[PDB]
C-alpha cells in the first residue's frame, strides 16, 4: 500500500518464542471467531488506511496501532507466547479507537459493542492447563 501508511504490526518473527496454550486456542476459536463475524467488525478487520480515509494525523496520534486482522494472523500463525499478549492487542485496538475518535461517534459505538462481547468472553477464559 501507500508509503504514507506505516508498516503493519509484526505477525511473523522466528526469533520470538511461541507456544500453543489452551487459552490461546480459546482466543482464536471463541473470542476472535465471535468478534470477527459481528455486524460491527468491518472497521477493525484490517489496519487503518489513513490515506484512503483522509486522516493524515491518524498515525501522528496513534503510535501503537492494532487491528483484528493482525490479531487473527498472530493467532493463526502462533505468534504469541501467552493469552495476555493477545488480550493486550485487543485492548490496544479498542483504546486506539477511543483515543482517536469522539465519544458520540459511530466507530466508538461499534467498538463499545465489540468490547462488551470481548469482556463477556474473557471472563470465561479457561484456566490454563
Q: Does 107 bind ligand IT8 (CB under 6 A)?
A: yes
When the beta carbons of 24 and 50 are compared against ligand IT8, the nearer one is 50
Stretch that binds ligand IT8, among 1-9, 18-26, 53-61, 74-82 (CB under 6 A): 53-61
Tally of CB atoms within 10 A around 116 = 10
As a whole number of angstroms, the distance between CA 29 and CA 27 comes to 6
Closest CA to 89 of 102, 73, 105: 73
Closest CB to ligand IT8 among 29 and 52? 52
User: Site for ligand IT8 (CB under 6 A): which residue of 34, 73, 101, 112?
Assistant: 101
Helical packing angle, 68-76 and 83-100, nearest 10°: 170
Q: Is 113 in the site for ligand IT8 (CB under 6 A)?
A: no
Q: Which of residues 68-97 bind ligand IT8 (CB under 6 A)?
A: 96-97
Question: From CA 91, how far away is CA 81, in angstroms rounded?
Answer: 17
Least Å distance between CB 32 and ligand IT8?
A: 17
For ligand IT8, the closer CB: 28 or 66: 66
CA dist 121 and 101 (Å) reads 25
Amino acid at each position: 500500500g501507500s508509503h504514507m501508511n506505516p508498516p503493519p504490526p509484526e505477525t511473523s518473527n522466528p526469533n520470538k518464542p511461541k507456544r500453543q496454550t489452551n487459552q490461546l486456542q480459546y482466543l482464536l476459536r471463541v473470542v476472535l471467531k465471535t468478534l470477527w463475524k459481528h455486524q460491527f467488525a468491518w472497521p477493525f478487520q484490517q489496519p487503518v488506511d489513513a490515506v484512503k480515509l483522509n486522516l493524515p494525523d491518524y498515525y501522528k496520534i496513534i503510535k501503537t496501532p492494532m487491528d483484528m486482522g493482525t490479531i487473527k494472523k498472530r493467532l493463526e500463525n502462533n505468534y504469541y507466547w501467552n493469552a495476555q499478549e493477545c488480550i493486550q492487542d485487543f485492548n490496544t485496538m479498542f483504546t486506539n479507537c477511543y483515543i482517536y475518535n469522539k465519544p458520540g461517534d459511530d466507530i466508538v459505538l461499534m467498538a463499545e459493542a465489540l468490547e462488551k462481547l470481548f469482556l463477556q468472553k474473557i471472563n470465561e477464559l479457561p484456566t490454563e492447563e
